Design a protein around this ligand. Sequence first.
Ligand code: A1AQ6
Length: 503
Amino acid sequence: GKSKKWKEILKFPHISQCEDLRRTIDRDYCSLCDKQPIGRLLFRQFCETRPGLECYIQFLDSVAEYEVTPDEKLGEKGKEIMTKYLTPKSPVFIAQVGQDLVSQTEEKLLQKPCKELFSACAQSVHEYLRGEPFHEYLDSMFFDRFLQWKWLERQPVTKNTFRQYRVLGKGGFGEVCACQVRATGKMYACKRLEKKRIKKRKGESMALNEKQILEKVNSQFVVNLAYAYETKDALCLVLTIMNGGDLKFHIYNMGNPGFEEERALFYAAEILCGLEDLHRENTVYRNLKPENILLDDYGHIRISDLGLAVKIPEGDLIRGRVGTVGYMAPEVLNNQRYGLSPDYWGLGCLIYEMIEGQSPFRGRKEKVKREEVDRRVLETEEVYSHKFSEEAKSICKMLLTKDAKQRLGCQEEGAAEVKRHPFFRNMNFKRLEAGMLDPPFVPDPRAVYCNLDHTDDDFYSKFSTGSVSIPWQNEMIETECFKELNVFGPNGTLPPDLNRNHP
Ligand SMILES: Cc1[nH]c(/C=C2\C(=O)N=C3CC=C(C(=O)N[C@H](C)c4ccc(F)cc4)C=C32)c(C)c1NC(=O)c1ccco1
């Protein structure tokens, strides 16, 4: 449901308007041709016009397909890629991989199919495209078209950019609504934070820290920030909409209470990936409880409520007795210097609670004081039942290690150590990261699973930074605004908006 004149709102500016962008955007290959979705598509499209570059894009696609193929179907897919791209007789043969590398992948196959068989090749292909082909693209009409898309991306964002609907959720500093971009029709979840409630409460550094954390991370398993704008009365955060309910509701109201181990395996895998993406920015979550794990329309989960998250300086630790009773690691309850370890304790709490249907230190039918819940977390060893496989008991016992030094995933290796745990032995993380594994529960679409100071003006400028690059470009592609607007001249000629002669 796009606006009536959405083609006028996203109307491409004349290429002459982007000269300032041309001389400020860093010409980074990985950023302009891979990370940024629209730049990626435009660079691919530029390679579509060259017969030599074409075969290199098709191969990377075929390797991406190879990485997610089942194990019993690797050798089949591997031989296909070989006899189509890496055969010197082929029509779409890759010539920029040395003859002493095509030979190696032929041996690798003879040995045994490995899911990274073409990793060496793919890297050589990128080693070639980052050179000449990339610098030719920079002087092509497709990079000028990219500058036009960046220009639109940079445009200011106000309340009139969105269409507010219904108040779906509440909390602290404000409420959570559901908004829609008028020009594209994509649904989001506004997080209206009332300004008066932030000044009176002197928590401006907490709201800015949450926005910066939300924008810096992009993950399929954490709520993403798309826009940050100020409105006269509140400071809004536009986040991923999640309409499938939260994990607490599904554990207890839809559960046994609890899930089958296999079903909990799926959610734990996605949660673990969410934590790994957060930890890549050395950011600790500290708020892992079932009601913060939300489900989307398809049944996948994202981590939500990053208001308790903080960015840990590399090589440093932090203090903070924060979180929810029952979901605080011992090092947090003791108010010690900790790192990312609280999140792996939380992950243990979640896996246990999903399988067993209750918290590892508080029975569902038990009524105990906050103090006794902490004593158990610090002294009592949790007990397991026949709902847990030996592998499930293991990973939970290791993640619930009282000593953060011996806790799983809390070594220099990080989330990788948790992904090898026998509990995930039947989990293909590559296919999960690529969205190829069907969720165990698909929500029904029609479901309802539920003052004039200047220092304030300086705090609003650092917050209301506008649209977020990657989410915005993804919004354009998903809504098919990119497909419809990204048109050129007939027979590969310059369109008017890209011709500097007549503006
Ligand atoms: C559209 C919609 N959006 C949300 C909330 C979210 C969403 O999507 N994505 C995030 C990210 C992050 C948060 C978050 O910070 N939460 C904490 C506590 C918080 C903090 C401060 C506040 F002022 C308020 C809340 C919330 C959300 C919900 C729950 C729904 N509707 C349903 O799920 C639903 C449909 C039918 C039956 O139920």
